[model samples]
Target: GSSGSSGDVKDVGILQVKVLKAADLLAADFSGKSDPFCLLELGNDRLQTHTVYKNLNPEWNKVFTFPIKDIHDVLEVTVFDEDGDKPPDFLGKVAIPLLSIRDGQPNCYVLKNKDLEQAFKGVIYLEMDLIYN
Candidate 1:
């Protein structure tokens, strides 16, 4: 869907996010892996990645697209470990400032922890694309 006229890039652009791979992830369960999944957000809008079980390394390689309603929003990605007995553990979260079609091109982004006090060394790789109509 578009926000406005095709003549203006401010109203029409594609917001693409690519969920790649993760490394050195802290496990939540006894077996490890922790049933990893991701919750990516842009303002009130959000999307999810599929769960990968039983391994420290997970390859999602999934790409999702959204219509650009506003470029003022920052893209937030939260990694979670699903648990059977209890609530899921939050691995980490990364917030990325986006560039509109009026600004720059697409690029890859690295995930980081939200807190720096007691940090988790998990790293998630991602690619972002912003295309103007």
Candidate 2:
């Protein structure tokens, strides 16, 4: 069930990802609102989305592309709150497997944080429409 035109699964050319809005985020600022930015890491390449200030739910409608060589390596995304006259604070992170977008699968994934002991800690709806093409 492909939502796009092509249904090819042989070769996934490049990774195309959209940094959507985040919801139910934890406040990292003293004023209760966190100035959020999305930081993405895949291989040695690094990318970032535009920062949204003074809001817990930040909408980052930006797209990023990366060249992926292996599907076993994980994709790391970190949410940081920009601080004034100070370094940014680490809000949270979403770790995703690289194989989620492979083989014509549904490429939509919700950002979630889980503990090392396999327990659910928090649900950060950091949106990203992941695709390989």
Candidate 3:
């Protein structure tokens, strides 16, 4: 009973994102380790992964799916260090264009600063796929 391909799928394609892990993340807390999580943005939609506490090198192994509307939209992945009762500090971020991705291939992306104009601390591992009709 897997024949369920009939509906209002009013989008260009489907985007699959795999956030594997991150290394050498900046320590925001006093314990020399930071609680890290990933935030993903595609068009007007946003999603996030669970936080891994007290680790510089966190393995998320998380996957996210997004409905693609504009093919020119760039996917934004931002890493933050979670604080107990305050705003999470920005660790690093990456911006990837959908048209430039090599489907299903794992890639190592270097994190960038706030303005996305310079390199920053840490590197994140990711994989992506875009499927269309």
List, residue by residue over 12-103, the lDDT tens digit for candidate 3: 88889998988777778677987889999887789998888767888888899998988888898988877889888877789889988866
Ranking by lDDT: 3, 1, 2
lDDT of 1: 0.71
- Model 1, 23-96: lDDT tens per residue? 77786766654687878877567899888777778788888887777767677888887777877777777776
* TM-score on alpha carbons, each prediction: 0.76, 0.70, 0.88
Off by over 4 Å in 3: 1-9
Task: Enumerate residue pairs that collide in model 2.
Answer: none
Tens digit of lDDT per residue, candidate 2, span 84-124? 88888765567767555445333434344445334232345
lDDT for each of the candidates? 0.71, 0.65, 0.84
Say which candidate scores most in lDDT: 3
TM-score of 2: 0.70
What's model 2's lDDT at 14? 64
For model 2, what is the alpha-carbon lDDT of residue 73? 67
Relative to the true structure, candidate 3 has a C-alpha RMSD (angstroms) of 2.4
Ranked by TM-score, top first: 3, 1, 2
